């Protein structure tokens, strides 16, 4: 006997116990929440353009974004935190972009996106998860959509021998591609084991069909299992091809005339399986059945025998297939031996015992279902605290439901997502809070307060603006002290320190048509004194926090006097923290 009775109220002056990192959904950012209050503490821009901080306008952010800075949109789903020895290490958060086929890395000490990659030769990065052991060496990313190779407009047939999609491994630390594995069918979600050897992905379109009926044709799709060690061996030996103009090593993980690749095994699993979730004890890849009212449990410790050819049938690694309810989509873990699965149709979370399910699969009459909790309504992902680690603590569960209906005040034709906080600390799940959220966050991840360590003020050597420091060095500028205007043809490079309540350069004059770069270094040492910079009627806006250098470039296409001002309330004299750009005509 043990009751679910955790406190959910965080009053004024008290602090949350966990960080929550929510996907921004179709809006493209990442959001930091406090748990259990469920309040949003910060927004981290990634694929969106943020007016407030200038992400997508500043030179530092556009440098990180590369050519994809031309896109103003992203579509996020799956946020994950880097691990060492199967425990969160607080270093990085990674997230997908389904719309423009990217992966982004967030540095959790500064809470900013610091690296971004467009995955080559694929369309739509959706499923995403991290290697656990011995650390997050790879980020594993699913490209969802089958395309021709090359995709040059000669062939559109998705059944062509060179039409396929690929599993993607990105080097977590350099954020360069590591390798890609061609697969049969398509990819939905993915997860990794607790050794570094195996990873797995559900596939819903084993039919390689383009119509909805054609995609639900097979009684069984599969989860494809990857022998990452075998892939690495082939890469070290130079046994790969490359595609197009990408140097990324490409391995062929498809079945050929019924013959298995060395890199993959295809395990039959019903049906359009969706979630692919690794239990915190490291025993199982659990695939949610979706169109089948089941989950399929793959025994990770049978995978070595599978790849060695010691098992008679790939179905032999399946050790449980519990029947749970209608529309199972995703699974999470309390660390006590239970799994928690969302039932999209029944609109519930079902708590079930994994080892009891395994015994039932063998024929024992044992009820593995512990409880079903109604949620409101149509849940997709769910997430228990530390569930992706061997420290899963069984304290909090968030279920992310797609249809909020009447759970909040009406706000027009568009509705919020309902992210419901559930106490799982005791024997009985208890619903404690309804959290409305914008643009369908879809999935989220939690970390203990003591697993995250952030900077109070920037380091002057920070790589985030190192390229700007280098520019300054070429101009002979000391960013910590200088207030100078550099003239170079029709290019003007203004450098200034800023400290509330005065810009270090309070006026400058240019010629109509000049290309103006303004570089600002906030030389305050006081935490929380953020500064801003806005050029009126020129589309220019950015943040400069303490000890940060930020820069932005725009053309002075309008003659006359044009004001700039500090946007971040920084001082009692904030309204008066302003300057003048004077633009001479021809």
| Site of interaction with K ion (CB under 5 A) | 402
With binding defined as CB under 5 A, does residue 420 bind Ca ion? no
Closer residue to a copy of itself (CB): 230 or 485: 485
With binding defined as CB under 6 A, does residue 570 bind ligand CUA? yes
With binding defined as CB under 6 A, does residue 568 bind ligand CUA? yes
Residues 329-358 that bind ligand CUZ (CB under 6 A): 329-330
- Which DSSP symbol is given to 241? B
Q: Judge contact between 96 and 141, C-beta under 8 A.
A: yes
With binding defined as CB under 5 A, does residue 165 bind Cl ion? no
Instruction: Work out how close the CB of 98 gets to ligand CUZ at its nearest, in angstroms, rounded to a whole number.
Output: 7
Closest by CA to 277, choosing from 354, 207, 215, 219, is 354
With binding defined as CB under 6 A, does residue 542 bind ligand CUA? no
With binding defined as CB under 6 A, does residue 415 bind ligand CUA? no
Q: Are strands 578-584 and 560-565 parallel, antiparallel or unpaired?
A: antiparallel
Closer residue to ligand CUA (CB): 329 or 570: 570
Residues 225-254 that bind a copy of itself (CB under 8 A): none
Contacts of 467 (CB under 8 A, 6+ apart): 59, 60, 63
Instruction: Work out how close the CB of 380 gets to ligand CUZ at its nearest, in angstroms, rounded to a whole number.
Output: 5
Q: 275 is in the binding site of which of Cl ion, K ion, Ca ion, none (Cβ under 5 to 8 A by kind)?
A: Cl ion
Residues 52/58/63/64 CA torsion (nearest 10 deg): -10
Instruction: Work out how close the CB of 576 gets to a copy of itself at its nearest, in angstroms, rounded to a whole number.
Output: 5
With binding defined as CB under 5 A, does residue 221 bind Ca ion? yes
What residues pair up with 282 in beta bridges, in sequence order? Answer: none
Q: Which of 336, 449, 473, 491 binds a copy of itself (CB under 8 A)?
A: 449
Closer residue to Ca ion (CB): 272 or 292: 272
Q: Which of 217, 247, 473, 580 binds a copy of itself (CB under 8 A)?
A: 580
Write each residue from 485 to 524 as x if it is in contact with a copy of itself (CB under 8 A), else as -, in one continuous string.
Answer: ----------------xx---xx----x------------
Closer residue to Ca ion (CB): 106 or 147: 147
SS3 labels along 130-165: ECCCCECCEEEEEEEECEECCCCCCCCCCCCCCEEE
Q: 53 is in the binding site of which of ligand CUA, a copy of itself, K ion, none (Cβ under 5 to 8 A by kind)?
A: a copy of itself
* Sheet containing 444-448, strands listed edge to edge, beginning at the edge strand earlier in sequence: 39-44, 30-35, 18-23, 444-448
What are the CA-CA distances from residue 132 to residues 93, 381, 389 (Å)? Answer: 13, 20, 8
> Alpha-carbon distance 13 to 24, whole Å?
28
Instruction: Work out how close the CB of 6 gets to a copy of itself at its nearest, in angstroms, rounded to a whole number.
Output: 15
Dihedral sign (CA 213, 187, 256, 154):
positive
With binding defined as CB under 6 A, does residue 274 bind ligand CUZ? yes
Which part of the chain contacts ligand CUA (CB under 6 A), choosing from 48-56, 91-99, 149-157, 566-574? 566-574
For 300, the 3-state DSSP assignment is helix
Instruction: Work out how close the CB of 330 gets to ligand CUZ at its nearest, in angstroms, rounded to a whole number.
Output: 6
Count of residues of this chain found to bind Na ion when the rule CB under 5 A is applied? 1
Closer residue to ligand CUA (CB): 467 or 501: 501
With binding defined as CB under 6 A, does residue 201 bind ligand CUZ? no
For 381, the 3-state DSSP assignment is strand
> Alpha-carbon distance 586 to 580, whole Å?
19
Write each residue from 57 to 96 as x if it is in contact with ligand CUZ (CB under 6 A), else as -, in one continuous string.
Answer: --------------------xx------------------
With binding defined as CB under 6 A, does residue 520 bind ligand CUA? no
- Which DSSP symbol is given to 315? G
Q: Judge contact between 343 and 350, C-beta under 8 A.
A: yes
Residues 75-134 that bind Na ion (CB under 5 A): 117
Give the pair of three-digit tokens for residue 186.
């398509």
Q: Judge contact between 570 and 586, C-beta under 8 A.
A: no
Closer residue to ligand CUA (CB): 125 or 500: 500
Q: Which of 272, 341, 389, 404 binds Ca ion (CB under 5 A)?
A: 272
Q: Judge contact between 331 and 322, C-beta under 8 A.
A: no
Q: Judge contact between 39 and 33, C-beta under 8 A.
A: yes
**Count helices and strands in the chain by DSSP H and E runs:** 6, 40
With binding defined as CB under 6 A, does residue 442 bind ligand CUZ? yes
* Sheet containing 295-299, strands listed edge to edge, beginning at the edge strand earlier in sequence: 276-278, 284-288, 295-299, 318-320
With binding defined as CB under 8 A, does residue 48 bind a copy of itself? yes
Q: Are strands 578-584 and 484-488 parallel, antiparallel or unpaired?
A: unpaired
Closer residue to Zn ion (CB): 555 or 575: 575
Q: Which of 182, 500, 518, 581 binds ligand CUA (CB under 6 A)?
A: 500
Q: 395 is in the binding site of which of Cl ion, Ca ion, ligand CUZ, none (Cβ under 5 to 8 A by kind)?
A: none
Omega cis (within 30) before 36: yes
Instruction: Work out how close the CB of 344 gets to K ion at its nearest, in angstroms, rounded to a whole number.
Output: 13
Residues 174-213 that bind Ca ion (CB under 5 A): 204
With binding defined as CB under 5 A, does residue 189 bind Cl ion? yes
With binding defined as CB under 6 A, does residue 574 bind ligand CUA? yes
Q: How far apart are the first and last CA of the chain?
A: 84
Contacts of 100 (CB under 8 A, 6+ apart): 47, 68, 71, 73, 74, 118
With binding defined as CB under 8 A, does residue 328 bind a copy of itself? no
> Alpha-carbon distance 320 to 322, whole Å?
6
> Alpha-carbon distance 441 to 382, whole Å?
11
Which part of the chain contacts ligand CUA (CB under 6 A), choosing from 5-13, 63-71, 159-167, 571-579? 571-579
Instruction: Work out how close the CB of 143 gets to a copy of itself at its nearest, in angstroms, rounded to a whole number.
Output: 10
Report H helices in 138-246. 212-215, 228-236
Residue with tokens 């990442």, as numbered in its chain: 30
Element (H, E) at 64: helix 59-65
Residues 256-285 that bind Cl ion (CB under 5 A): 275-276
With binding defined as CB under 6 A, does residue 328 bind ligand CUZ? no
Count of residues of this chain found to bind ligand CUA when the rule CB under 6 A is applied? 10
> Alpha-carbon distance 486 to 251, whole Å?
51
Binding residues for Cl ion (CB under 5 A) = 189, 275-276
> What does the binding site for ligand CUA look like in residue numbers (CB under 6 A)?
500-501, 531, 566, 568-571, 574, 577
Please give the residue ranges that form the binding site for Na ion (CB under 5 A).
117
Residues that bind ligand CUZ (CB under 6 A): 77-78, 126, 189, 274, 329-330, 380-381, 442-443
């Amino acid at each position: 006997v043990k009751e679910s009775k955790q406190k959910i109220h965080v009053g004024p002056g008290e602090l949350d116990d966990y960080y929550g990192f929510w996907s921004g959904g179709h809006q493209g950012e990442v959001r930091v929440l406090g748990v259990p209050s469920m309040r949003e503490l910060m927004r981290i821009p990634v694929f969106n353009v943020d007016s407030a901080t200038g992400w997508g306008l500043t030179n530092e952010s556009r440098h990180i974004m590369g050519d994809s800075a031309k896109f103003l949109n992203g579509d996020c789903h799956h946020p994950h935190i880097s691990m060492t020895d199967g425990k969160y290490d607080g270093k990085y958060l990674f997230i997908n972009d389904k719309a423009n086929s990217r992966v982004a890395r967030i540095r959790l000490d500064i809470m900013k996106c610091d690296k971004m990659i467009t995955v080559p030769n694929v369309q739509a990065i959706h499923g995403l998860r991290l290697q656990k052991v011995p650390h997050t060496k790879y980020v594993f990313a699913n490209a969802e959509f089958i395309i021709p190779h090359p995709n040059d407009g000669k062939v559109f047939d998705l059944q062509d021998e060179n039409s396929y999609t690929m599993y993607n491994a990105i080097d977590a630390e350099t954020m360069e591609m590591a390798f890609q594995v061609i697969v049969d069918g398509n990819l939905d979600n993915t997860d990794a084991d607790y050794t570094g050897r195996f990873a797995a992905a559900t596939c819903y379109n084993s039919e390689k069909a383009f119509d909805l009926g054609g995609m639900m044709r097979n009684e069984r799709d599969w989860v494809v299992v990857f022998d990452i060690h075998a892939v690495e061996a082939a890469v070290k030996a130079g046994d790969f091809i490359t595609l197009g103009d990408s140097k990324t090593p490409v391995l062929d993980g498809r079945k050929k005339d019924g013959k298995d690749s060395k890199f993959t095994r295809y395990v039959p699993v019903p049906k359009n399986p969706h979630g692919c979730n690794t239990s915190s004890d490291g025993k199982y890849f659990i695939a949610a059945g979706k169109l089948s009212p089941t989950c399929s449990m793959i025994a990770i410790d049978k995978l070595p025998d599978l790849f060695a050819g010691k098992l008679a049938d790939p179905r032999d690694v399946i050790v449980g297939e519990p029947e749970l309810g209608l529309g199972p989509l995703h699974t999470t873990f309390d660390g006590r031996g239970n799994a928690y699965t969302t039932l999209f149709i029944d609109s519930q979370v079902v708590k079930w015992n994994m080892e009891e399910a395994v015994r039932a699969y063998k024929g024992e009459k044992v009820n593995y279902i512990k409880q079903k909790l109604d949620v409101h309504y149509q849940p997709g992902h769910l997430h228990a605290s530390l569930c992706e680690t061997n420290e899963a603590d069984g304290k909090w569960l968030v279920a992310l439901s797609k249809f909020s209906k009447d759970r909040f005040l009406p706000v027009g034709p568009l509705h919020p997502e309902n992210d419901q906080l559930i106490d799982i600390s005791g024997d009985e799940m208890k619903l404690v809070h309804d959290g409305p959220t914008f643009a369908e966050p879809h999935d989220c991840i939690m970390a203990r307060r003591d697993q995250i360590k952030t900077k109070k003020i920037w380091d002057r050597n920070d790589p985030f603006f190192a390229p700007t420091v280098e520019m300054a060095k070429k101009d002979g500028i000391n960013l910590d002290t200088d207030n100078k205007v550099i003239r170079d043809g029709n290019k003007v490079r203004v450098y200034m320190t800023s400290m509330a309540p005065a810009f270090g350069v309070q006026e400058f004059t240019v010629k109509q048509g000049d290309e103006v770069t303004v570089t600002i270094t906030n030389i305050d040492q006081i935490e929380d004194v953020s500064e801003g910079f806005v050029v009126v009627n020129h589309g220019v806006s950015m943040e400069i926090s303490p000890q940060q250098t930020s820069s932005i470039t725009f053309v002075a296409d309008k003659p006359g006097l044009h004001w700039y001002y500090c946007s971040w309330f920084c001082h009692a004299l904030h309204m008066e923290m302003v300057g003048r750009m004077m633009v001479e005509p021809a």
